[PDB]
Design an enzyme around this catalytic site. Structure first.
Site, PDB file in Angstrom:
ATOM      1  N   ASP A  65       0.826  -1.195   0.000  1.00  0.00           N
ATOM      2  CA  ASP A  65       0.000   0.000   0.000  1.00  0.00           C
ATOM      3  C   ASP A  65       0.866   1.253   0.000  1.00  0.00           C
ATOM      4  O   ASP A  65       1.950   1.285   0.589  1.00  0.00           O
ATOM      5  CB  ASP A  65      -0.925   0.012   1.217  1.00  0.00           C
ATOM      6  CG  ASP A  65      -1.803  -1.218   1.293  1.00  0.00           C
ATOM      7  OD1 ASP A  65      -1.780  -2.024   0.341  1.00  0.00           O
ATOM      8  OD2 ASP A  65      -2.518  -1.377   2.305  1.00  0.00           O
TER       9      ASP A  65
ATOM     10  N   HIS B 228      -1.166   4.409  -0.145  1.00  0.00           N
ATOM     11  CA  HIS B 228      -2.178   5.255   0.494  1.00  0.00           C
ATOM     12  C   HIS B 228      -1.926   6.739   0.234  1.00  0.00           C
ATOM     13  O   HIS B 228      -2.046   7.578   1.129  1.00  0.00           O
ATOM     14  CB  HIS B 228      -2.258   4.970   1.994  1.00  0.00           C
ATOM     15  CG  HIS B 228      -3.032   3.734   2.331  1.00  0.00           C
ATOM     16  ND1 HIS B 228      -4.397   3.641   2.160  1.00  0.00           N
ATOM     17  CD2 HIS B 228      -2.633   2.539   2.827  1.00  0.00           C
ATOM     18  CE1 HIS B 228      -4.805   2.443   2.536  1.00  0.00           C
ATOM     19  NE2 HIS B 228      -3.755   1.755   2.945  1.00  0.00           N
TER      20      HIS B 228
ATOM     21  N   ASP C 253      -4.399   0.378  -2.940  1.00  0.00           N
ATOM     22  CA  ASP C 253      -4.346   1.300  -1.804  1.00  0.00           C
ATOM     23  C   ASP C 253      -3.272   2.372  -2.009  1.00  0.00           C
ATOM     24  O   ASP C 253      -2.284   2.457  -1.276  1.00  0.00           O
ATOM     25  CB  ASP C 253      -4.131   0.543  -0.490  1.00  0.00           C
ATOM     26  CG  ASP C 253      -5.414  -0.047   0.056  1.00  0.00           C
ATOM     27  OD1 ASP C 253      -6.424  -0.047  -0.677  1.00  0.00           O
ATOM     28  OD2 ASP C 253      -5.412  -0.510   1.216  1.00  0.00           O
TER      29      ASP C 253
ATOM     30  N   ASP D 179      -6.175   6.828  -1.079  1.00  0.00           N
ATOM     31  CA  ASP D 179      -6.884   7.357   0.075  1.00  0.00           C
ATOM     32  C   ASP D 179      -5.929   7.526   1.249  1.00  0.00           C
ATOM     33  O   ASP D 179      -4.848   6.935   1.289  1.00  0.00           O
ATOM     34  CB  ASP D 179      -8.045   6.440   0.483  1.00  0.00           C
ATOM     35  CG  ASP D 179      -9.371   6.885  -0.098  1.00  0.00           C
ATOM     36  OD1 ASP D 179     -10.383   6.190   0.126  1.00  0.00           O
ATOM     37  OD2 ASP D 179      -9.400   7.932  -0.777  1.00  0.00           O
ATOM     38  N   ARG D 180      -6.353   8.351   2.208  1.00  0.00           N
ATOM     39  CA  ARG D 180      -5.631   8.575   3.462  1.00  0.00           C
ATOM     40  C   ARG D 180      -4.219   9.104   3.202  1.00  0.00           C
ATOM     41  O   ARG D 180      -3.214   8.496   3.577  1.00  0.00           O
ATOM     42  CB  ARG D 180      -5.601   7.300   4.311  1.00  0.00           C
ATOM     43  CG  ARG D 180      -6.948   6.606   4.428  1.00  0.00           C
ATOM     44  CD  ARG D 180      -6.916   5.498   5.465  1.00  0.00           C
ATOM     45  NE  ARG D 180      -6.916   6.024   6.827  1.00  0.00           N
ATOM     46  CZ  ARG D 180      -7.042   5.273   7.917  1.00  0.00           C
ATOM     47  NH1 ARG D 180      -7.177   3.959   7.808  1.00  0.00           N
ATOM     48  NH2 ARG D 180      -7.032   5.836   9.117  1.00  0.00           N
TER      49      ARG D 180
ATOM     50  N   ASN E 146      -9.327  -1.992  -2.215  1.00  0.00           N
ATOM     51  CA  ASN E 146     -10.633  -1.648  -1.664  1.00  0.00           C
ATOM     52  C   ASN E 146     -10.892  -0.149  -1.683  1.00  0.00           C
ATOM     53  O   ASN E 146     -12.055   0.266  -1.699  1.00  0.00           O
ATOM     54  CB  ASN E 146     -10.762  -2.181  -0.237  1.00  0.00           C
ATOM     55  CG  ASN E 146      -9.680  -1.657   0.682  1.00  0.00           C
ATOM     56  OD1 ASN E 146      -8.499  -1.669   0.338  1.00  0.00           O
ATOM     57  ND2 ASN E 146     -10.077  -1.193   1.860  1.00  0.00           N
ATOM     58  N   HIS E 147      -9.840   0.672  -1.680  1.00  0.00           N
ATOM     59  CA  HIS E 147     -10.005   2.118  -1.734  1.00  0.00           C
ATOM     60  C   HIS E 147     -10.204   2.641  -3.150  1.00  0.00           C
ATOM     61  O   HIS E 147     -10.595   3.800  -3.314  1.00  0.00           O
ATOM     62  CB  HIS E 147      -8.799   2.811  -1.096  1.00  0.00           C
ATOM     63  CG  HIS E 147      -8.732   2.657   0.392  1.00  0.00           C
ATOM     64  ND1 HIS E 147      -9.362   3.522   1.260  1.00  0.00           N
ATOM     65  CD2 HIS E 147      -8.108   1.737   1.166  1.00  0.00           C
ATOM     66  CE1 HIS E 147      -9.130   3.142   2.503  1.00  0.00           C
ATOM     67  NE2 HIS E 147      -8.371   2.062   2.475  1.00  0.00           N
TER      68      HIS E 147
ATOM     69  N   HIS F 239      -4.819  -7.871  -3.424  1.00  0.00           N
ATOM     70  CA  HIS F 239      -4.975  -6.905  -2.340  1.00  0.00           C
ATOM     71  C   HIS F 239      -5.607  -7.542  -1.106  1.00  0.00           C
ATOM     72  O   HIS F 239      -4.979  -7.633  -0.046  1.00  0.00           O
ATOM     73  CB  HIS F 239      -5.808  -5.717  -2.821  1.00  0.00           C
ATOM     74  CG  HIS F 239      -6.155  -4.746  -1.736  1.00  0.00           C
ATOM     75  ND1 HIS F 239      -5.201  -4.046  -1.031  1.00  0.00           N
ATOM     76  CD2 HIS F 239      -7.352  -4.363  -1.232  1.00  0.00           C
ATOM     77  CE1 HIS F 239      -5.794  -3.270  -0.142  1.00  0.00           C
ATOM     78  NE2 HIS F 239      -7.099  -3.444  -0.243  1.00  0.00           N
TER      79      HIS F 239
ATOM     80  N   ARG G 195     -14.065  -5.316   9.691  1.00  0.00           N
ATOM     81  CA  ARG G 195     -14.134  -4.132   8.842  1.00  0.00           C
ATOM     82  C   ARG G 195     -15.563  -3.852   8.397  1.00  0.00           C
ATOM     83  O   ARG G 195     -16.012  -2.700   8.419  1.00  0.00           O
ATOM     84  CB  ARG G 195     -13.220  -4.304   7.627  1.00  0.00           C
ATOM     85  CG  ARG G 195     -11.753  -4.496   7.971  1.00  0.00           C
ATOM     86  CD  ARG G 195     -10.925  -4.727   6.719  1.00  0.00           C
ATOM     87  NE  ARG G 195      -9.507  -4.897   7.021  1.00  0.00           N
ATOM     88  CZ  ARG G 195      -8.620  -3.906   7.024  1.00  0.00           C
ATOM     89  NH1 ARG G 195      -9.004  -2.671   6.738  1.00  0.00           N
ATOM     90  NH2 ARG G 195      -7.349  -4.153   7.311  1.00  0.00           N
TER      91      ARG G 195
ATOM     92  N   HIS H 168      -3.075  -5.543   2.828  1.00  0.00           N
ATOM     93  CA  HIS H 168      -4.296  -4.931   3.338  1.00  0.00           C
ATOM     94  C   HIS H 168      -4.230  -4.551   4.808  1.00  0.00           C
ATOM     95  O   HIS H 168      -5.084  -3.781   5.258  1.00  0.00           O
ATOM     96  CB  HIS H 168      -5.492  -5.868   3.115  1.00  0.00           C
ATOM     97  CG  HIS H 168      -6.823  -5.196   3.247  1.00  0.00           C
ATOM     98  ND1 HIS H 168      -7.077  -3.941   2.739  1.00  0.00           N
ATOM     99  CD2 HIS H 168      -7.974  -5.608   3.827  1.00  0.00           C
ATOM    100  CE1 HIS H 168      -8.327  -3.607   3.003  1.00  0.00           C
ATOM    101  NE2 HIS H 168      -8.894  -4.601   3.662  1.00  0.00           N
TER     102      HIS H 168
HETATM  103 MN   LIG Z   1      -5.439  -0.124   3.082  1.00  0.00          MN
HETATM  104 MN   LIG Z   2      -6.912  -2.408   1.424  1.00  0.00          MN
END
Ligand SMILES: [Mn+2]
Ligand SMILES: [Mn+2]
Lengths: 249, 273, 582, 293
Positions: free
Chosen positions: D56, D58, D84, D87-88, D116-117, D166, D213, D240
């Site tokens: 990731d 991110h 990933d 995001d963030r 997933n993002h 992922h 989650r 992940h």
């Molecule tokens: Mn993540």
């Molecule tokens: Mn993820």
């Protein structure tokens, strides 16, 4: 908002056709809450923007069923025509005949489009936009079902409009007749699953449209293509010199 | 069709004073065999021809009485073809969770996707299966028992056409060939009108979503008019089982709409039916 | 239709999405210029005054849009009607909209005429500074310095006394804003005004029982110290900062440790000689590491503005014990700060002062336990190369290069590789072939790529400094022998070395010694080595003569251009089209 | 036509490598080209050794540049990102823009998967939509990125033995043939095989179990062994979960979690790691720390 029509007529770079669509959508949304001076100030601009192009194909991508329906209803404000379209061969103004033929062509096009295997956009979520799209699709289906029961006289109106030529214009009358013949052929080609002995009229209209396009189709473009020749060949093969593949059949 | 000497001569990380550069191996790496099936193209279909001839000699009931005037064609025994279909179903997919003759709805195909995919893989690894279907499609009531294979193949083809991004069908040649072969087999097995025979013919230049919708209409028609051992009454003339259709309204309407949406390329195919 | 804008504004602004709201705020200007000046001055402004929304983005949008109505209302002669909307949007619950409002008011206050200012804007702040909520008082204190020089002395005294009254509040929720405004408000005040009434206010704010007010009281103090001349510091502001720097809290101490260079540069050198020495010493011997790290970071530039009459004395007598006691601290933050800040005082002390005490502390901070201090002590070693002899710094770093050259971190290794070419040329040649050759050969096979390219550049510098025929039998064979490993990383490293050495080693050696390796490494099935070989051939093209480029380079390039990959093919085509070989 | 476009791509990459975003038309053309390129890739991208798989990001452009400085330059060595990277993060558009530029420029030298993002309902509640609205003014770049994220492949098959993805395993999936027969051109739903492939997590559970989650399941060691034995695999790479050393082995060296985002959310202060796989399928875990700004 007021100078948008002049800006679109001067240059079609920014907001060529999306501005008229947004104006029509705003007028339709405001028409529910007792539109006094809001829908009247936008319907005229929408009609002017639609008449500036003077086409039907280029005005079908975004206005699929409801927006174009509202546009046609606003443009047909000149002639009431509460009853069925008849007596069109008499002395009538050209704008009324143009509105009636455009409405008939639009109705035929929606009737033909409502039976297509065109793939739909996949969805994997649920929100307010999904509910709005579902409501719009339900309203479009209801409008198509309501217009299908009244399409029996549309073919007769198109035939009467194509037979008459009192529009004080030979080229315009010929183009209108060719468009009506193409629409009638497209409508009859989709009526093969109902009953037989109907492909003869479709083949006749296709041959007439082909002869018209060969002699003189119209002054504008985007009105005829190889689809007409393909439909004529299909009608000739269904009716039954010959080709190698056709001779065996 | 279908140890340490070398590790010592190049060790010590070329420094003789530190550890190795890597941190070990995961498995083995660089699989030695990597063999592909390239035996032969010719003289392979003739073995299949000999096997089909043996099977025809086995199933055809005797046989040799000079039927007709000069073109006596022996019919295939229904019991032999039924046994062939049964052993084919047992060899391809021994599962029995959905082995019922009644065709389940379309959404039901979203739960047994693994079985359909394994059936498609078994069909793509051995084409002889298709030929075996051509032996089962000869007898009318025989194809009604080998329905699990057809259902799985149709579900696999539907799942493949639903996830196909190519605008042309020629990008996936095996899938189109298998679709046409499956439709022809299930049509010549006295189960579908000749409209489906024209549909698998026009499949050659159709859009992927159009082919998917046509196969979905096929699934719906097979769900309505299910292949069952009854409605195949015997005829006093010959041993053939004639199916009298008491056809599909909405199915023919969908086919006509698909044909009309592509008139610019399927114009000559309309006059055939 | 005159009612059409109202009918379209009363419904479009009330929706579920904010993008249409922002679009309407952007189009307010067009609506106003289309409706006319009389129509926006008659009823549009009173209509927009009483619009209380629920969200906050539309508030910021209208606040930033109201500041662009200079030539759309009538100019400075009609700025008295845009006051109700601003005073209504100033008293809200959010904070950022208040800052935007005060910025807009400070921006539009320049084009206001002085007469209209003194006639209308003064009652605005007079009524705004007496509100019930703290937002009104925090927004009123920021509109006094811009309108000070334009008003008469009577209005000046009135606003000064009103400010003195409003800064006598009990809770600091408004005293914070008052103290932030003292920074920009004292720019226009004279000497008598700050000596008579500002000093008592500052003394009362400095003796507050809260800690958050000193955060800005120290800023006000440094501001008035920089603004005022020298003759009014040693008796007015010194006791306040002295009693504030030794408070029970560590926040004010941290703040006065940060903002100390401005003090020591404004009060002059003599004032720093009298009583700033204890005030600076008490900030280096505290229990909190923040004040010590701040003092360490600031002392470097504090010494820069010190006169040369008592600099060395106070450094060798007072600064040296503090440095020695802060170096041996257990906290890592202060050690890293010292390692990053002390490498700037070398040119100040001189040449004969580095070997006295700077070298011991440098060697102590170099061979430390935590890598955080080493990353700082090794990233600032170039500024001590000119003030210290090359031989001395090369000899002092001998017991440390045997360990710092190969450790866990790579930043220290990067700095060592970058600083090596200044040492390998001074320590002779026997030391090189003794240990430095092994060090470079080990660096060339490191895991990371930055160390590899740094060692490559260092080897280039060494072969440019020493000679060509010297490395022909010591470095070239060892590098060429590495092009036989199953790993592609080592092969790419050897290709990069061949590329970097082809421009220094002439053309006679790169014809039959390094060229055959690049020619034979073309049949490598690894797709990530063929394009590197093609780029290497392109780089060595102009170096080699046309005979070698036409004899064997052209056929091998034609052979390489006929593979199945696309990246290597494009690289080879580019190499062919840049060298004019095809 | 091709040389000028290649030079424009190099200029775009050099501009992105200096904390400089592109314009609306440039991002639109890049997203279009990535859409025409990723259409040919299947759900299980057949990646060939040697490679350097990451985890990731991110949306951390500085950490991405640190990773590039550690694990070799992008055009030199191969890269395999497992989602990933949107995001963030403060710099999220720049990271995904550089990644997609390297993908459209080095389609055979870098591979990126879907996380997933990479969706439309997650980017609106984590700041990516806010960043796209603030930087580019409008909300068209975000729409283009979310329309492009549907074309990213799901998993990757390295040397026919390593299976990188992922999320992780799925209860409705028993072989790679099911993954290859999935329609990835679809928004990530709340339930199904793709949701589990993008939201799974390993643990010592044994069997299955609902994840904390909110989406995806939680498999154990026996499930990982069954999945590796029924598909000829020897390892399952994933990214992940947040780790400390950078790489974590689970289920008797069957699952490898590789988190290559140092200082996750700027509050943990951990390290990061990547896995460099040589030609002989030899793995090396290269670790690093967040670069100072
Ligand atoms: Mn993540
Ligand atoms: Mn993820």
């Amino acid at each position: 908002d007021p100078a948008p029509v002049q800006l679109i007529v001067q240059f079609l770079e920014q907001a060529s056709k999306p501005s008229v669509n947004e104006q029509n959508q705003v007028q339709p949304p405001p028409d529910n809450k007792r539109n006094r001076i809001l829908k009247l100030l936008a319907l005229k601009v929408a009609a002017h923007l639609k008449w500036d192009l003077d086409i039907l194909e280029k005005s079908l991508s975004v206005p699929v069923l409801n927006m174009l329906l509202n546009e046609l209803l606003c443009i047909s404000k000149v002639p009431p025509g509460t009853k069925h379209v008849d007596m069109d061969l008499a002395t009538l103004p050209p704008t009324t005949a143009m509105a009636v033929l455009l409405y008939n062509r639009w109705a035929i096009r929606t009737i033909v489009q409502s039976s297509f295997p065109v793939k739909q956009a996949k969805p994997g979520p649920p929100q307010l936009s999904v509910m709005n799209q579902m409501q719009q699709e339900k309203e479009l289906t209801e409008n198509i079902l309501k217009v299908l029961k009244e399409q029996a006289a549309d073919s007769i109106l198109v035939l009467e409009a194509a037979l008459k030529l009192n529009k004080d214009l030979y080229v315009h009358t010929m183009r209108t007749l060719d468009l009506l013949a193409m629409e009638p052929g497209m409508v009859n080609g989709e009526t093969e699953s109902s009953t037989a002995g109907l492909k003869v009229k479709t083949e006749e209209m296709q041959c007439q449209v082909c002869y018209d396009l060969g002699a003189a189709y119209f002054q504008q473009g985007s009105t005829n293509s190889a689809v007409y020749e393909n439909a004529r060949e299909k009608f000739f093969r269904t009716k039954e010199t010959p080709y190698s593949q056709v001779h065996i059949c | 069709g279908q140890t340490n000497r070398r590790h010592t001569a190049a060790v010590p990380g070329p420094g003789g004073i530190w550890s190795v550069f890597h941190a070990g191996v995961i498995g083995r790496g660089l699989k030695p065999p990597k063999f592909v099936q390239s035996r032969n193209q010719q003289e392979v279909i003739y073995n299949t021809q000999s096997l089909l001839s043996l099977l025809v000699h086995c199933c055809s009931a005797p046989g040799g009485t000079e039927c007709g005037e000069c073109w006596g064609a022996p019919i295939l025994s229904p019991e032999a073809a039924k046994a062939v279909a049964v052993t084919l179903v047992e060899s391809v997919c021994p599962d029995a969770a959905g082995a019922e003759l009644a065709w389940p709805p379309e959404e039901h195909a979203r739960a047994t996707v693994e079985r359909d995919l394994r059936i498609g893989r078994r069909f793509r690894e051995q084409p002889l299966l298709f030929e075996l279907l051509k032996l089962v499609a000869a007898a009318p009531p025989a194809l009604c028992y080998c329905s699990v294979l057809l259902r799985g193949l149709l579900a696999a083809l539907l799942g493949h056409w639903e996830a196909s991004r190519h605008p042309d069908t020629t990008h996936s040649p095996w899938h189109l060939e298998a679709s046409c072969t499956l439709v022809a087999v299930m049509a010549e097995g006295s189960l579908l009108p000749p409209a489906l025979g024209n549909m698998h013919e026009v499949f050659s230049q159709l859009a992927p979503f159009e082919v998917r919708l046509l196969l979905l209409s096929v699934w719906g028609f097979l769900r309505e008019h299910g292949p069952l051992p009854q409605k195949f009454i015997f005829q006093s003339e010959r041993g053939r089982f004639i199916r009298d259709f008491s056809e599909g309204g909405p199915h023919l309407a969908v086919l006509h709409s698909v044909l009309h949406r592509n008139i610019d390329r399927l114009g000559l195919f309309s006059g055939r039916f | 239709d005159s009612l059409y804008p109202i009918a379209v504004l009363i419904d479009e602004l009330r929706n579920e999405d904010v993008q249409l709201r922002l679009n309407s705020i952007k189009k307010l200007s067009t609506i106003a210029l289309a409706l006319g000046v009389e129509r926006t001055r008659s009823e549009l402004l009173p209509f927009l005054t009483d619009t209380i929304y629920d969200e906050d983005e539309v508030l910021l949008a209208l606040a930033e849009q109201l500041g662009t109505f200079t030539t759309l209302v009538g100019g400075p002669e009609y700025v008295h009607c845009l006051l109700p909307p601003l005073e209504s949007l100033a008293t809200v619950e959010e904070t950022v909209v208040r800052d935007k409002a005060v910025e807009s008011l400070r921006a539009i206050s320049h084009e206001h005429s002085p007469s209209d200012l003194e006639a209308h804007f003064v009652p605005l702040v007079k009524r705004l500074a007496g509100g019930d909520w703290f937002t009104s008082r925090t927004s009123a204190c920021g509109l006094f310095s811009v309108c000070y020089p334009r008003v008469s002395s009577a209005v000046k005294a009135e606003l000064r006394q009103y400010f003195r009254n409003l800064c006598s509040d009990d809770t600091p929720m408004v005293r914070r804003a008052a103290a932030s405004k003292l920074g920009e408000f004292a720019k226009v005040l004279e000497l008598d005004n700050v000596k008579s009434e500002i000093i008592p206010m500052f003394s009362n704010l400095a003796s507050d029982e809260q800690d958050s007010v000193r955060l800005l009281a120290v800023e006000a103090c440094v501001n008035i110290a920089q603004l005022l001349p020298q003759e009014d510091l040693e008796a007015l502001v010194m006791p306040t900062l002295r009693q504030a720097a030794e408070d029970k809290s560590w926040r004010v101490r941290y703040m006065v440790a940060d903002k100390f260079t401005e003090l020591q540069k404004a009060v002059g050198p003599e004032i720093t000689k009298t009583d700033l020495v204890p005030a600076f010493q008490n900030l280096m011997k505290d229990c909190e590491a923040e004040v010590r790290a701040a003092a360490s970071h600031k002392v470097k530039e504090f010494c820069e503005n010190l006169s040369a009459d008592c600099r060395e004395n106070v450094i060798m007598s007072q600064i040296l014990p503090c440095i020695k006691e802060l170096v041996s601290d257990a906290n890592q933050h202060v050690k890293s700060a010292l390692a990053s800040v002390i490498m700037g005082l070398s040119p100040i002390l001189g040449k004969d002062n580095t070997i006295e005490h700077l070298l011991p502390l440098f060697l102590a901070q170099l061979k430390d336990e935590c890598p955080e201090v080493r990353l700082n002590i090794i990233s600032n070693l170039d500024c001590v190369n000119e003030v210290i002899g090359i031989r001395q710094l090369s000899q002092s770093l001998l017991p440390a290069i045997v360990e710092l050259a190969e450790d866990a971190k790579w930043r220290v290794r990067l700095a060592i590789i970058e600083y090596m070419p200044l040492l390998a040329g001074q320590l002779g040649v026997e030391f090189f072939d003794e240990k430095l050759n092994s060090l470079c050969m080990a660096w060339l096979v490191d895991h990371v790529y930055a160390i590899r390219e740094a060692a490559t550049s260092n080897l280039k510098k060494l072969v440019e400094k020493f000679g060509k025929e010297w490395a022909h039998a010591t470095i070239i064979p060892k590098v060429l022998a590495m092009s036989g490993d199953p790993n592609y990383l080592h092969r790419m490293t050897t290709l990069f070395c061949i590329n970097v050495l082809s421009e220094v080693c002439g053309q006679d050696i790169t014809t039959k010694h390094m060229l055959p390796t690049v020619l034979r490494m073309a049949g490598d099935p690894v797709a990530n080595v063929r394009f590197n070989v093609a780029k290497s051939l392109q780089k060595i093209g102009p170096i080699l003569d046309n005979s070698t480029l036409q004899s064997e380079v052209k056929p091998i390039l034609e052979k390489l251009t006929q593979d199945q990959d696309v990246d290597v093919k494009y690289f080879a085509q580019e190499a062919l089209t840049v060298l004019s070989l095809a | 036509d091709e040389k000028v476009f290649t030079k424009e791509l190099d200029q775009w990459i050099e501009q992105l490598n200096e904390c400089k975003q592109l314009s609306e038309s440039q991002v639109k053309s890049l997203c279009e080209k990535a859409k025409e390129i990723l259409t040919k890739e299947s759900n299980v991208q057949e990646v060939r050794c040697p490679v350097t798989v990451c985890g990731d990001v991110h949306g951390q452009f500085h950490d991405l540049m640190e990773l590039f400085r550690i694990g070799g330059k992008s055009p030199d060595t191969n890269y395999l990102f497992m989602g990933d990277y949107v995001d963030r993060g403060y710099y999220s558009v720049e990271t995904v823009t550089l990644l997609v530029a390297l993908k459209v420029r080095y389609r055979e030298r870098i591979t990126i998967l879907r996380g997933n993002h990479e969706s439309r309902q997650i980017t609106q509640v984590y700041g990516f939509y806010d960043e796209c609205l603030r930087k580019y003014g409008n909300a068209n770049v975000w729409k283009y990125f979310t329309d492009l994220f549907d074309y990213l492949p799901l998993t990757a098959l390295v040397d026919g033995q390593i299976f990188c993805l992922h999320g992780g395993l799925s209860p409705s999936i028993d072989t790679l043939d099911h993954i290859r027969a999935l329609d990835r051109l679809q928004e990530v739903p709340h339930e199904g095989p793709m949701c589990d492939l993008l939201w799974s997590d390993p643990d010592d559970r044994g069997g299955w179990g609902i994840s904390p989650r909110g989406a995806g399941y939680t498999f154990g060691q026996d499930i990982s062994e069954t999945f590796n034995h029924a598909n000829g695999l020897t390892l399952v790479s994933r990214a992940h979960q947040l780790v400390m050393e950078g790489y974590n082995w689970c289920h008797d060296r069957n699952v490898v979690t590789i988190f290559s985002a140092p200082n996750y959310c700027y509050r943990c202060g951990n390290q990061a790691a990547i896995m460099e796989l040589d030609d002989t399928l030899k793995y090396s875990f290269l670790q690093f720390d967040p670069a100072p700004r």
